[PDB]
């Protein structure tokens, strides 16, 4: 099975920018794009789709 961070929601955070990041959506079982503000947020936040896939889909 997958680590508990995979269950966290997408969190845009508290910062002043916008950049593309990837999160694992538990309800869809997919790694999807979100808007990250550059600060704050949670560990379900990947710069590379591949890293979300290895962490939350399957090793």
Which domains can be identified in the chain, with CATH numbers? 1-59 (4.10.410.10)
CA-based angle 20:7:29, to the nearest 5? Answer: 70
Method: X-ray
Cα 2 versus chain centre, distance: 14
CB neighbours of 56 closer than 8 A, spacing ≥ 6? 2, 3, 5, 6, 24, 31, 44
The resolution, in angstroms to one decimal, equals 1.3
- Measured CA to CA, the distance from residue 3 to residue 12 in angstroms comes to 21
Dihedral angle sign, alpha carbons of residues 26, 31, 35, 40: positive
Question: Which H/E stretch holds residue 30?
Answer: strand 30-36
CA distance 42 to 58: 20
- Structural contact between residues 22 and 52, judged by C-beta atoms closer than 8 angstroms: yes
Q: Which run of H or E residues covers position 35?
A: strand 30-36
Backbone φ, ψ for residue 42 (5° rounding): -140, 180
Report yes or no: 43 and 9 within 8 Å, Cβ to Cβ.
no
């Amino acid at each position: 099975d997958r680590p508990s961070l995979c269950d966290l929601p997408a969190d845009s955070g508290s910062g002043t920018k916008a950049e593309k990041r990837i999160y694992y959506n538990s309800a869809r079982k997919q790694c999807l794009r979100f808007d990250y503000t550059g600060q704050g947020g949670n560990e379900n936040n990947f710069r590379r789709t591949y890293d979300c896939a290895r962490t939350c889909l399957y090793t």
